[PDB]
Symmetry: C3
Subunit: 494 residues, 3 copies
């Protein structure tokens, strides 16, 4: 024989995954990764963020100093975890703007308490109740001072405390709401109380409300909790004529990365940066689908459960529809399921035999750009610490509707971003792999000047006698057309 | 003659629309669709959502039971429609946090009222006024009970009602603000009222304010409306010493898809899923430009009035600049305005005659991907029910500024998304149609191995004698080069 | 010699900038622009928006009429600028919902004040204090009237004022909080005050709070400021029995483009549309990185400091690795650093000599589309006037957390948009420049039918005798293959 066949092609596999592109909803690739984390271990990892498990304590009971919460004094945290089995076992109380105080104390990240010398004059301190039993005796919140009439008098109280330090000081105080007109007089000589608490720049005044409420732990009376922040250089004044739950000291305040989360997952020993209420998740993927609530370095929440990024080429599973020869057939036809060493490669039919090989230059380069794509996409800063509430237990009206509207707007815009990026990138991936294929072909055609012709099967009918060494030279990039030119021209045109 | 001409091309039209792509602000396509709905019928369609037209009633007058609003008792709705001609004809009143109560009742979607056995003891019930005439006699809101002194006394009222059911119970109540110190004593024996209303977990106390206001319907006094929600397992207590507008029962509460809209459009019999204040619009297109306020499955609001998606190729209107022969001219030159059967096609000049035909394989495939594009783009879930207010009649300050800022941020981000998607998709459309053209050419060149040559007009000078059957074979995909090879080689090279 | 060489190529430069594309994080282009403005002059330009510098005055002291703020009466502005050295030198005061009133007055844009005939009857007007010295004498806010007991009486005050005009009227009023029970009686005969201020549709009632506060400028008493808006057709009533700081007139209200900014930059004579707290910036670029707070037509704020848009092609710096001949080498190899006239061009080796030239058709067109890209990208409407606060000095809790969350969400979504647009556009730029190159090549190959062959260096071995005129004809687009066909065919194939 006086002629040779040389064909080009790309690897195929037996089993493929389907991806979403621009034009079409399904297409079959050789390999594809997942970009959405769907699963959790179900436990909270204790490194590298410092976790503080509240057990039967809320953060507002720990601060006030409820008796079953005395483990928590001078504690610090990055994340505080509240449990759904938590309860209260002291005087019954309410906090106007509860939500604001809870958010302020959680971002501070400490319960550091400094006792101060306050001089209450002409009154009896350390009032108590059997709604709050610390041991067999009656008790009260550890950080507040119930004041009551001494003898037959409650004098107008007037005290001042100045900030001369270089940090901010948070004072918690309150007021008692008695259930009758006969209890008010019994505790405080007057008939109507008043509590005024002021700085140089602000003031608040509260009056007490009298009347009957549902029984909780044997009482139809309640306490109302308030707060004031005093800056460096400013003064505090307190001026009450009755019903004052006085402060005992101040709390230090920091700006940092601390927050709070309501969860029911157990705590465990392991290392994880992202925490959700369903336990810790890994942060290798760019998106997540576990929970919209998060803490620390985390993937973005989206609505989808699956987004597949193509890491391979298109998969034309082979025509075992073949000839007697299974005449070597190239890329224009189908893929090659018998190639393992590399993606792009050459099959040669010669007098010597049939053969096969792979190509490093091309296979390397494709792999390079696809790996690039992967790196821009998979990994980046989304490191976030304190945020709005995204779950509610009551109906409130206006503010809560705006908080729900803000969160849904964010989710639909990030979900649209995630859908388009995958479709764009998947199209570009198919295109770059197919151009790479056609680049090897033109390189081959350019080397075989007039000593070869194209058939249109993906194949080059060479009109001279090519041996294994000659095929190897073409494959190599050293084929010297001049040597066989005269023979090939006389063979092809005559 | 011993030779033939075969040219390739694509269809042109006489009149075209202009589209926006990546690079340029205008370009001329063969056909293009609209993606923004600009128009409305001006009527509200009554299926498939249940519409309740308020006529001269607001939703807050229907709930309280104003006399001209007694048609509305035990009503239900998906959407409630308020009219701008609506007024009030009862006792003059104000609701602190009016906006919150209106939003809460609208999302519930019912006015189901259950009368309860409340025991008011030592007082006269069913107080009345000629500001609210139900028939010739004086009257009052149907769902509230005005209580007044019996003989020369108003006892301290103390009542309780427990929730033992498995649903939430909404109580509406209020307080009277008399205009003098002489009217307060006349209605209630005391000089100053007080109203306390509490659960196990919450409390509210209101005091009445006395003084003179503008006359409305013959009165300088007003009523203030309040509300409490009681959960399954909890209790309600009410404790007033004067000025109490007592409740008569509770309202049931649901979670569902109900809302409210201020409109002035008439109601009609037809089927439409999306409702706006300018009437119902169809939901075939992805974007909308009619109104930012919506209900149900709807397109997204954007700022643009027009966005055109190219559904065709580029339009090179023909060179009637021609030869004596109008020598058949291909795609490299211009488009063909004389082709009707299909997009891509062949024109042959032969000894037998001039001719023309179209190509199904190509025309089909292009049409296929363009139709795909259309489907990803035009249709999807945007199904939304209760949202924030987006129009305001008064100035309020902070909250309203944040609500306006949230809405404008959303609009500019969705408008940028709509501008880029059209430009991206339009570029891809032009590219896919032009590659499809060049694909048919290479297929043709590959079949005509050495028996044809390229001229560069988009045309193939075939150096053998081609008849109609031969042209048909090329067009077909069965052309056998071997038959005419010797003749063509001797004709072209010698 | 009987043959010729003709090669094609594109311009290279010595020094290049690196851009970010889809696949890769760095690549070297010939030229690139900046899209993020990083710098400011540090001054506020006084045209074309009307700037009003407050010097030691806040906007809330200018409105009340503090003595060191009497320059500001009947002023108007587009932007009001407050300075950090500003202070207060009158009666000490607080405004509940301070933030709301400041935002309302800033968007109005005027301090136009109309004195009205209010008849205060049985009281002494124009009360004074040495905390507010206007000259040697005692003084008070210019726009408020302190009223006090006449003889031994303060009658119940009852006044009305109707709006019969066609615009909205803003009344500012207040209430005095005395420090003792002995001062209250001294100023107002009664023991407890009350102030009720109402329209047909709204009402507010305030009570005064008595007790001791920190000393500011020799006083332990304070004033509380309130406000009411009265619409066209409505009435105002005022009904106080004590402690009323009465209004003297109303302020007109407009809807317009006015706002306020806290800055410390000096004012200068120049023209600039965008103002930031760090001074005016130019608005030629689409993004900005100077400050998130802005006024007027401005670029969008993003987190990045640099985004480079490729305005040129890729830069293969030349192989000075060469031959003895430096045989002319084309684009497949490297770029040409010796070409100045244009981007794409031709180098010819002939018997006559070596030579070089450039190509207008191609160079023009590339430049055209790149300039197009630039125009869509760089310039558009972002013209915005009044917005939310984005910096806070105190901790407040809930509302402030939602305002901070809304702003960060907006920034991360606009930063992601800015990163993808640059990467998309940069890829498209590289692609359009490289296709333009390959378009000139095919045009050249198409003209040289069988009288030339391709070598694969980017070069055309022409197998006939080409002189300068012949090379010029090819370059020109008038090369007539027929003339040299026989000679070339006999030279190449035999
Ligand atoms: C205004 O109106 C309100 C509402 O009615 C009144 O509030 C009620 O006040 C009474 C008297 O204090 C309360 O009665 C008490 O209820 C307690 C809770 O009951 C639970 O526990 C018992 C015991 O297991 C169960 O039997 C019962 O089903 C509940 O599960 C009881 O513990 C109290 O018992 C006390 O008295 C008995 C006497 O036999 C002793 O054995 C006990 O040890 C204990 O000392 C008592 O029965 C009632 O609960 C209140 N109602 C609510 C819902 O709060 C106001 O009193 C009223 N005020 C005025 C001024 O009129
Ligand atoms: C504190 O200050 C306030 C504000 O001034 C006082 O409020 C005013 O009180 C008077 C007395 O109640 C009100 O006068 C009444 O106005 C009604 C509305 O007027 C409209 O309708 C009439 C009739 O069509 C028109 O003529 C008029 O132009 C208006 O369009 C009148 O209807 C009332 O008429 C009554 O008396 C006449 C007597 O001739 C009878 O014919 C009528 O049938 C009817 O009985 C009356 O004139 C006045 O409107 C109040 N002002 C406002 C704006 O509310 C407080 O009284 C004052 N309080 C104290 C304690 O000092
Ligand atoms: C309830 O409790 C509060 C808090 O203690 C009391 O408020 C104090 O009241 C007193 C008396 O008014 C105030 O004392 C005054 O302080 C002024 C400010 O002091 C600064 O300036 C002086 C002078 O430069 C400095 O020496 C000092 O270090 C501060 O920088 C003084 O200016 C006042 O001086 C007056 O008296 C002196 C007498 O020698 C004269 O020379 C002066 O000219 C002037 O007339 C005075 O000393 C004190 O500041 C208040 N404390 C605060 C922080 O406000 C309430 O009085 C109390 N109320 C009741 C009912 O008990
Ligand atoms: C809770 O924290 C307070 C405050 O202490 C601070 O926080 C701790 C966790 C540590 O980090 C401390 O380093 C930090 O200051 C503790 O208050 C401390 O109480 C002791 C005992 O009363 C104080 O010692 C005093 O020392 C002075 C002399 O300098 C004597 O005059 C006193 O009589 C007394 O002995 C100590 O100064 C004080 N720390 C303060 C105010 O800075 C508190 O004990 C701690 N409680 C628990 C349960 O850990
Ligand atoms: C408005 O709705 C209330 C509540 O009824 C509920 O809503 C209705 C629209 C229907 O869907 C009802 O199926 C649903 O329960 C109506 O209250 C109803 O009033 C009647 C008459 O008083 C009650 O009948 C009573 O039946 C008991 C015996 O079971 C007798 O002891 C009573 O004397 C009385 O005859 C009925 O139970 C009650 N429904 C309740 C509380 O569930 C109300 O009539 C209705 N009004 C209008 C204008 O439609
Ligand atoms: C501040 O502005 C008020 C209101 O005037 C309005 O704003 C000004 C800046 C100008 O633009 C005015 O054109 C505009 O109306 C000034 O009030 C004005 O005061 C004068 C003097 O009292 C009033 O003149 C009166 O004229 C009538 C006859 O028409 C006489 O009966 C009066 O006795 C008196 O002479 C003038 O009408 C009034 N403008 C009003 C109410 O519209 C105010 O003077 C001005 N102050 C400063 C510091 O500029
Ligand atoms: C325009 O002016 C603004 C301020 O009005 C400049 O922003 C400020 O930039 C400095 C330097 O980055 C910041 O200081 C740093 O703050 C951090 C956090 O507290 C601290 O850890 C550092 O040690 C340092 O003090 C300052 O906070 C920042 N202000 C804000 C609110 O961001 C801005 O850089 C100026 N821009 C131009 C173009 O001049
Ligand atoms: C298809 O892509 C997946 C990507 O998950 C490849 O899976 C990796 O396989 C290697 C084998 O050594 C593991 O070490 C990795 O942990 C796997 N996952 C990741 C994160 O890369 C898989 O090998 C690819 N298959 C083919 C046939 O190429
Ligand atoms: C150009 O595109 C428009 C798209 O609106 C085509 O209009 C449709 O024409 C058919 C004709 O049978 C109607 O049944 C449809 O209702 C039309 N609208 C839609 C929604 O598709 C139009 O036919 C196209 N023209 C050409 C020449 O292709
Ligand atoms: C590279 O691009 C920059 C863009 O900044 C060009 O810089 C411009 O140069 C002209 C020279 O006449 C100036 O008038 C402009 O003000 C410059 N800036 C702008 C805003 O265009 C620069 O000329 C380009 N360089 C090359 C080699 O093409
Ligand atoms: C190349 C075409 C890009 C298609 C962009 C997506 C258009 C509609 O895409 C939709 O986005 C939703 C998020 O809002 C996702 O939940 C849906 O899965 C998706 O269908
Ligand atoms: C391929 C280039 C993409 C251009 C993206 C749009 C850049 C500016 O585009 C602008 O977006 C505005 C919405 O904010 C629209 O109102 C304007 O019509 C549009 O010009
Ligand atoms: C073609 C690939 C597009 C990459 C899109 C950007 C994916 C992550 O991109 C990140 O966006 C951040 C804004 O949130 C920027 O601050 C970071 O610089 C950028 O790395
Ligand atoms: C082929 O190229 C290699 C380098 O990759 C070279 O060592 C070898 O001599 C070349 N010739 C053959 C084996 O084709
Ligand atoms: C062309 O192809 C058709 C099938 O599409 C076949 O039936 C016919 O015989 C073929 N030959 C001709 C008419 O060219
Ligand atoms: C080349 O083209 C120009 C027009 O651009 C023409 O004037 C000239 O005669 C042509 N022939 C030559 C110089 O190649």
């Amino acid at each position: 024989n006086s002629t040779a066949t040389l064909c080009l092609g790309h690897h195929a596999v037996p089993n493929g995954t389907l991806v979403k592109t621009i034009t079409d909803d399904q297409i079959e690739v050789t390999n594809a990764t997942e970009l959405v984390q769907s699963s959790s271990t179900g436990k909270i990892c204790n490194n590298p963020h410092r976790i503080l498990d509240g057990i039967d304590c809320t953060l507002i009971d720990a601060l006030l100093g409820d008796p079953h919460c005395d483990v928590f004094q001078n504690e610090t945290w990055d994340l505080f975890v509240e449990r759904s089995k938590a309860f209260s076992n002291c005087y019954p109380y309410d906090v106007p703007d509860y939500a604001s105080l809870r958010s302020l104390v959680a971002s501070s990240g400490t319960l550091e308490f400094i006792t101060e010398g306050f001089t209450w004059t002409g009154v009896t301190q350390n009032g108590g109740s059997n709604a709050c039993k610390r041991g067999p005796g009656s008790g009260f919140f550890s950080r507040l001072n119930w004041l009551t009439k001494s003898g037959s008098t409650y004098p107008v109280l007037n005290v001042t405390m100045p900030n001369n330090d270089n940090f901010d000081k948070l004072y918690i105080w309150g007021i008692h709401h008695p259930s009758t007109n006969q209890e008010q007089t019994s505790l405080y000589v007057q008939a109507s109380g008043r509590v005024t608490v002021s700085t140089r720049r602000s003031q608040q005044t509260i009056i007490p409300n009298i009347g009957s409420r549902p029984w909780v732990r044997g009482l139809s009376s309640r306490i109302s909790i308030y707060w004031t922040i005093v800056k460096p250089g400013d003064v505090l004044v307190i001026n009450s004529n009755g019903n004052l739950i006085a402060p005992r000291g101040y709390f230090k305040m920091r700006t940092g990365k601390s927050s709070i989360m309501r969860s029911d997952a157990p705590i465990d020993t392991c290392i994880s940066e992202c925490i959700t209420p369903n336990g810790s998740i890994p942060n290798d993927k760019p998106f997540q689908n576990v929970n919209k609530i998060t803490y620390g370095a985390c993937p973005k929440y989206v609505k989808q459960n699956t987004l597949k990024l193509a890491t391979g080429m298109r998969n034309v599973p082979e025509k075992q529809t073949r000839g007697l020869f299974g005449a070597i057939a190239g890329f224009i036809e189908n893929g090659w399921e018998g190639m393992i060493d590399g993606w792009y490669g050459f099959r040669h039919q010669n007098s010597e035999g049939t053969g096969q090989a792979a190509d490093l230059k091309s296979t390397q380069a494709a792999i390079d750009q696809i790996n690039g794509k992967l790196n821009r996409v998979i990994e980046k800063t989304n490191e976030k610490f304190h945020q709005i509430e995204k779950e509610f237990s009551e109906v409130e009206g206006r503010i809560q509707d705006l908080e729900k509207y803000v969160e849904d707007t964010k989710i639909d815009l990030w979900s649209y971003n995630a859908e388009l990026l995958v479709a764009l990138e998947n199209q570009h991936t198919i295109d770059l792999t197919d151009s790479e294929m056609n680049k090897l072909f033109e390189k081959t055609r350019r080397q075989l000047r007039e000593n070869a012709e194209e058939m249109g099967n993906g194949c080059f009918k060479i009109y001279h006698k090519c041996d294994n060494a000659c095929i190897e030279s073409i494959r190599n990039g050293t084929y010297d057309h001049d040597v066989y030119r005269d023979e090939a021209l006389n063979n092809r045109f005559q």
